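[worker-b] picked up task from shared queue
[worker-b] task type: protein-ligand structure
[worker-b] ligand name resolved to 2-acetamido-2-deoxy-beta-D-glucopyranose; SMILES cross-checked against name lookup, match
[worker-b] sequence length check passed
[worker-b] input payload:
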Amino acid sequence: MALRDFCSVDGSDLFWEWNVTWNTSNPDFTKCFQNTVLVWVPCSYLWVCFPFYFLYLSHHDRGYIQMTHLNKAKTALGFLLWIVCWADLFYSFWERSMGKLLAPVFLVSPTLLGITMLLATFLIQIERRRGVQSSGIMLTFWLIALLCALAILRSKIMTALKEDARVDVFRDVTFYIYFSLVLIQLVLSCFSDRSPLFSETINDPNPCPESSASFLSRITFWWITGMMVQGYRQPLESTDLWSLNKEDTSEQVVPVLVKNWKKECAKSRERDPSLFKVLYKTFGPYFLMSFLFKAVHDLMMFAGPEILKLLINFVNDKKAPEWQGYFYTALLFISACLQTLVLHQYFHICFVSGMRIKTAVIGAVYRKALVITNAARKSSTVGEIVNLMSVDAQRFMDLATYINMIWSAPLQVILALYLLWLNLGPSVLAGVAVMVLMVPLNAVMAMKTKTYQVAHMKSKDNRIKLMNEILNGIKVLKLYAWELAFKDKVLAIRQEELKVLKKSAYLAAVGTFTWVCTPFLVALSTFAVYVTVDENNILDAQKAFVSLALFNILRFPLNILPMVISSIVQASVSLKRLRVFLSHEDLDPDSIQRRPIKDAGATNSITVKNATFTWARNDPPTLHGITFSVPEGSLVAVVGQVGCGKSSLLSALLAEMDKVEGHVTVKGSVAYVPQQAWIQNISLRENILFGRQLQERYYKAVVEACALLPDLEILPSGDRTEIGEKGVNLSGGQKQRVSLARAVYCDSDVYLLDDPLSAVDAHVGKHIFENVIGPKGLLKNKTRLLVTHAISYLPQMDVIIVMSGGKISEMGSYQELLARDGAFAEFLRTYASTGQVKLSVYWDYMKAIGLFISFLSIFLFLCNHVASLVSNYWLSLWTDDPIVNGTQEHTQVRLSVYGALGISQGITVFGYSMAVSIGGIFASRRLHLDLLHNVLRSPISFFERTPSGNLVNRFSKELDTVDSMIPQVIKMFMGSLFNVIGACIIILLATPMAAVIIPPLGLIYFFVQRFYVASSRQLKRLESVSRSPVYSHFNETLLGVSVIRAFEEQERFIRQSDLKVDENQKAYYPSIVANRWLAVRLECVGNCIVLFASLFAVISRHSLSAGLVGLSVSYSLQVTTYLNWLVRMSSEMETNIVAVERLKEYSETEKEAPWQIQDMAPPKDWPQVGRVEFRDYGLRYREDLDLVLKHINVTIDGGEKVGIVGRTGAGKSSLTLGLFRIKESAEGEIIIDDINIAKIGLHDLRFKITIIPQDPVLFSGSLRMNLDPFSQYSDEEVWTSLELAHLKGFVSALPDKLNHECAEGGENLSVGQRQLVCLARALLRKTKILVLDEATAAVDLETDDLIQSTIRTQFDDCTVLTIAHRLNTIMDYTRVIVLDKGEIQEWGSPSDLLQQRGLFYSMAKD
Ligand SMILES: *[C@@H]1O[C@H](CO)[C@@H](O)[C@H](O)[C@H]1NC(C)=O
Ligand SMILES: *[C@@H]1O[C@H](CO)[C@@H](O)[C@H](O)[C@H]1NC(C)=O
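[worker-b] inference finished, payload out:
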């Protein structure tokens, strides 16, 4: 009677009774339940949330806020609420003093309500003090209080409306005004007050809105709506992204990880420190909220099927009051909304934690790379140290979203199995077995398609390299007329790729069959066992449609669990890698005693006493007991035998090498120039200043003194000229010169130079020695350590040190070492001896597949979905069957028809997948054949104007995404779209008012994809573009760690790395928030759809059949996942289909003349005799430029040897290009053997003359293929050419006599042998006309002597119309035609040209 007497002294009003609360046409809570629970639940929530929230606020202060009107009103309303709450308490005390007996509840509930109201006021004050603008706890507390007070208000209004019930006017009016105040407090809690007075973000012009967004705007992610609208209205660039939150900046994230790791390493000082412990301690506090939210979402997920069971029971029962269904549908909608909010908060927390982990790891790795010892860095390679940011920190980034799965997915699986066992008996095993047996099948198939993928990509790389080689040699290919052979070879390689693609297509067909038809298979197995095991097993709507809704939510934790565990093991290997790197021994800072230049301890800037060093503890010491001192300002030299240890003394003095024993000290700033130059990917000028103020006078002085002024003239922009990506054109001497210039401009005290002169010749060498470093140099009043192998500059230098195998042989001035003649005696003697993609792109891709295959695929897909819909409707009918004599009739027929429909769906799914995949390979074949033909038919002009990068990208990446990506996107997009359509048609067929709700909610509010699609695509682009520079900077800083450490520039580079990481996160964060935004909106659409389906089912409960209701609600439960899939796949289609537009881009660019036109085929005159003819010819590179060739008229019979002579840009190479009409003759004409070659199809003539460039290119393949791709000539002719190429003996000396594969461009042969092979090809093709365009100056006087003697013996008969600037080889030619100014000067035999002392003789004298 504890609860019963607590109601009243007589215990008349019961605490809970279905008599009034549930089994009645008008529900209402009994007065005890109101006055106890409806007032204890909000008090309980506030008092349980205060401890944790106060602990969090004490650990999280955002400053201070003024007392504005809003907060003053909220405090005043809180105090008024407490006094009005104690009003009824005082009334009850007065009544008890009056003698009237009253219950304990009236004397306990108001007390707790008043104290919790005062608590709310106090916590609102402390929230103001601690700087929170929109309270989350208060909003939910007020919402709970308003809901409970609303229930009590409805009860009280109903009771008062009774014309016989007693009314307690005092308590009624007190509760009325309490309700009004609570409602106004809730409406005020939605607002936000002024920003904190300590808002340091005032300087920041573009802060992240999340810092100052309301709680409602924060759970719905509304604050990114402006960004997503703008991203569709106009393009988004990096200038528009918001600044990061202070808690996300690397300057606030990296130090905590660094400090925690240092603390644990110190603790371990045995047992190796564990990076997992540090990462956990550092990032778990913000990650446990993820566990809480995930648990809440997992629990709320199962509230769907149970409420569906209740709704089905309500529809079947026709004696239950109508409001029960409305209660159920409201409950379902509320649960779905809460679940979506909680899940997306969980995802946000996980993603932000991953972002922070990535930032911290990148920063810690960067800061460690600058202090790792030389042995540690030399253990690994720079490409593997960079991978610590490239892959090893992205794995931690992505695992944060999957780590929680390891406990959530088993929980979901066990809950689903338990509910299935409760709902449908042990026959659930028949479906869980099919689902568990499915995952080994798809894992095996994934491996079997991974092997096919790698096998196809390895075969595709052959074509890709063949492309990268052929386009590089397009001119010679066009010039020989060999394009058909290479077209055929590429086509064969494409055929191999397409076979592999067909096999992968079969695999993908079976895979999508499994993925689509697994739920039907599970349902069939379960229902078959359940109904066949026992006759009394009756399939009802709550057994079938509750089981399916639970099978769907058991599907996901099983299908994604193997991926999660694989990701965990990969992250384990990642963490071991990072732990090994971060545990490396670091340089001992105090081994090198640095002291300020102001110290007057002694007049020597460098001192050393018995110092020995080594690059590793175990390795033997290199420098042995050196002891020397360098007086301040002296110019000291260290010269000795190479490899004897002179080149390591500077590095030892820079603290690079471990100091085993000794005592050395260096004063002042240190400037260092290493032997291997370090150059950044920035402008030459910025590289020279190395981050200092530009003093124009001093900068000019150092650049002119360092002899850089002639160098900046060659490159376009001068000092402003950016070095580009890793030295666009900088040579070794240029690199050393700019490094030295940076060293001088730094203006340090001691200068350690590791032979900056080595890669520089003597002339400008001695120039810079005199101007910058020597006794007359720029820094002649500084301390300089020189290690160099030069002799002539040694005498000027003050005191000289000679090394011997890591020991100090002797030191002194140069006169003294002349006198004693010690080590330097031998040294001188021996050593010195956009918008939306057009629909026409989709249409032309559909044509590329084939309209027949496309129609077949669409027909099969529609058949699949009609089969599935009819199957679900048939299941509904089966569950609608009656119970007669304890058993259901028609059981066998229902089961058989269900099975038949399912197998029809399965075979149809398999068919449509195979059809679309085969059509995809068909399209991939035709598109590539067309692209190749169009490119190979285009003129050379298009080849020079279009950078080769675009063509290789078009052939590799666009073709790859067309072959592999888009056919699968078609699968998934069609699946999602028609799943959504099927759900909608089911819903609106069961209840046609769904047709009313769908327009104002489906189409209109589904234009939220118009913004996400436009904006996320831009944001991911920015993310990748900003992701690359972080790794670029890490590599660039790893290359030059010693230089940075010498100049004391560690802070600058750490700050730059921080900026690069922050710029990448600036684009990464909006992408995550955008995903959350779209997910919230789409799941809101789905929740509303399920609400309306259930609500119209409740309205039409008297006409629906209790099986249609379950079907509609079950499909509505899936609508949300289908919508998310559809939007994501629509975006992934839009951003990826443009590859088809790109692959057909050159389908209309102007092509060459018709290759082979057979209407006027010529006779077999051939060029043999070597005739040359021109009739007022004229050619020009591009018609807007100047005519390089003007009015050439000549007609000479064959059998002659004429060379062509001219000055720079005279018209020689243009004539060579115009010989084979490779450029269309604007004016004039050329006729050979009475054939107008300017008209006939160029293939019909290009094979019937010959030409060879300066360096004729070879190809990756057999020497037989290079000599003849058609291989029509007999191998005896091959050997003929080889002997006339002076190679038969050498070629036979190769392992393969005739088919020895030759590398690209003749790499398998030396450059001299390469030109020998080019001569070999030239002769081998049975040729007449040959040319050496500038080749005379690039070939040594022995091999070109061979080629000349061949023109005397082999091309004695052949006609050579060449251009040799070293025409001394061709003076013996019968005649020479001299041309200049783009026109013919004169002609004749070389004799009278010599005697006339003319222009030709003027170049002859040169
Ligand atoms: C609900 O209340 C009374 C209380 O005894 C119960 O006997 C009866 O079944 C119900 N009476 C109504 C609805 O009048
Ligand atoms: C529920 O309400 C009906 C109608 O008043 C009544 O006949 C029935 O006895 C009640 N059944 C239960 C279990 O409360």
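[worker-b] attaching auto-annotations
[worker-b] The chain has 51 helices and 21 strands.
[worker-b] releasing lock
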